[PDB]
Each structure stands twice: as structure tokens, then as C-alpha cells.
């Protein structure tokens, strides 16, 4: 599960560019030249317009997600496998994913690199009427972490804000398994009785 000192250095350096990404995407959807500051009064008014509309928030979420996911893909492509301390065939975690015995390179990357952007029903993390994604974050915060982008991995651990956001996305799937009325029972029963 460990990365080498060289491989872990790459991880911290690529994830260091992710801090700018949050505001960069927020400035792109809002349409503002020279990349305005994160605390800009016109930008904060512009982000509010986005908050009140389901479509406008969707454009903001899809742009920020694609940009942070590009940072994720970079971390994974660099660190795995050329940055892992123990390497295949000896790295059993890596071996099981490559052999097709159990698991995939996606699970391996969440363990050794980062969880990534926590996607909820196609979009990012839900946001309150106050413009806050959590009571810890600033209203209309232009940061990747605030949107649900988890820089942390399961090996090193995940921060409480990231933990709560992971809890959201984790449960989201189980909720869909509870609300799914569609069954193949009657569909097959109708065909078999007429085709027997």
C-alpha cells in the first residue's frame, strides 16, 4: 500500500496545483477576465446567481469536476506504478488488480493516491441556501476541497470534511438500490409462457 519517497513527492507536487483549480473553474463559468480574486465582490454576486439555478450550478459543477479529475488522472498516471515502493509481482495489491483475481487499478489509486472528486447524482457536493457546502467552509468558497474533491487517500487517511463528503457519495449508491421498482420477474414470465 506504500509509495516510495520519490513517488510520494510527485503526489504532493501535482496535488499542489489543485488549490488554484477551484477558483480557476469558478472564474471560467462566471465569465471574468485576468482571473479575478477568490474574495471579489462581483464574483461572489455572480456565484449566487449560479447557486439559485439548477442548470447554472450544473455548468459550474461539470467544469470544476472535469478540471479536478484531470489533476486526479495526472497523480494516478505518475505515481502508479512508477512511484510505488513495492512493485509487481511482489506488490500483491497491484498483482490482484492486474491478474483480475480481485479489484481494479481504480481501487488501487484510491488506496495509494487519492479518492478524487466525490460525485453526487452526476454533480458535486450539495450546497446550502447560505452558499456553504459545510459549516466549516466559507460561503461561496472557490476551492476544490469545498466542492468535494478529496486529496487524501485511504492509506494516509481522510480529513473530517472529506469524510462527511465521502459518506454522502457512499450512501448515494445504497439509496438508489432502495428506490428501484423495476423487476425482470414478470417480463421473463410473460415471454416463457408464450414461448415454452
| Interface with other proteins in residues 116-145 (CB under 8 A) | 116-117, 119, 125-130, 132-136, 138-139
Give the three cell numbers for residue 152: 487524501
Q: With binding defined as CB under 8 A, does residue 82 bind other proteins? A: no
User: Of 157, 182, 183, 185, which one interacts with other proteins (CB under 8 A)?
Assistant: 157
Residue partners of 14: CB distance under 8 A and separation at least 6: 71, 74, 75, 78
CB of 4 to other proteins, least distance (A): 18
Distance CA 172, CA 112 (A): 24
Between CA 98 and CA 132, with CA 166 as vertex, the angle to 5 degrees is 145
Q: With binding defined as CB under 8 A, does residue 65 bind other proteins? A: yes
Q: With binding defined as CB under 8 A, does residue 164 bind other proteins? A: yes
Where in 13-52 is the site for other proteins (CB under 8 A)?
28-31, 45-46, 48-50, 52
User: Of 6, 19, 87, 190, which one interacts with other proteins (CB under 8 A)?
Assistant: 190
Binding-residue total with other proteins (CB under 8 A):
90
User: Of 34, 54, 174, 183, which one interacts with other proteins (CB under 8 A)?
Assistant: 174
Q: With binding defined as CB under 8 A, does residue 187 bind other proteins? A: yes
Distance CA 157, CA 59 (A): 31
Residue partners of 93: CB distance under 8 A and separation at least 6: 1, 103, 108, 111, 112
Amino acid at each position: 500500500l506504500r509509495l516510495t519517497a520519490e513517488g510520494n513527492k510527485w503526489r504532493t507536487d501535482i496535488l499542489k496545483t489543485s488549490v488554484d483549480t477551484g477558483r480557476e473553474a469558478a472564474a471560467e463559468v462566471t465569465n471574468l477576465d485576468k482571473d479575478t480574486p477568490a474574495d471579489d465582490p462581483e464574483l461572489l454576486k455572480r456565484l449566487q446567481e449560479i447557486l439559485r439555478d439548477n442548470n447554472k450550478s450544473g455548468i459550474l459543477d461539470a467544469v470544476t469536476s472535469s478540471k479536478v479529475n484531470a489533476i486526479t488522472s495526472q497523480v494516478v498516471s505518475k505515481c502508479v506504478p512508477d512511484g510505488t515502493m513495492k512493485k509487481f509481482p511482489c506488490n500483491s495489491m497491484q498483482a490482484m488488480a492486474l491478474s483480475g483475481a480481485k479489484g481494479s487499478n481504480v481501487n488501487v489509486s484510491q488506496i495509494m493516491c487519492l479518492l478524487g472528486q466525490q460525485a453526487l447524482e452526476g454533480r458535486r457536493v450539495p450546497v446550502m441556501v447560505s452558499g456553504k457546502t459545510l459549516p466549516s467552509f466559507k460561503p461561496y468558497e472557490t476551492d476544490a476541497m469545498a466542492g468535494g474533491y478529496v486529496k487524501g487517500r485511504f492509506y494516509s487517511g481522510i480529513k473530517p470534511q472529506e469524510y462527511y463528503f465521502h459518506c454522502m457519495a457512499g450512501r448515494e449508491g445504497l439509496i438508489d438500490t432502495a428506490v428501484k421498482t423495476s423487476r425482470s420477474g414478470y417480463l421473463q414470465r410473460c415471454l416463457t409462457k408464450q414461448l415454452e
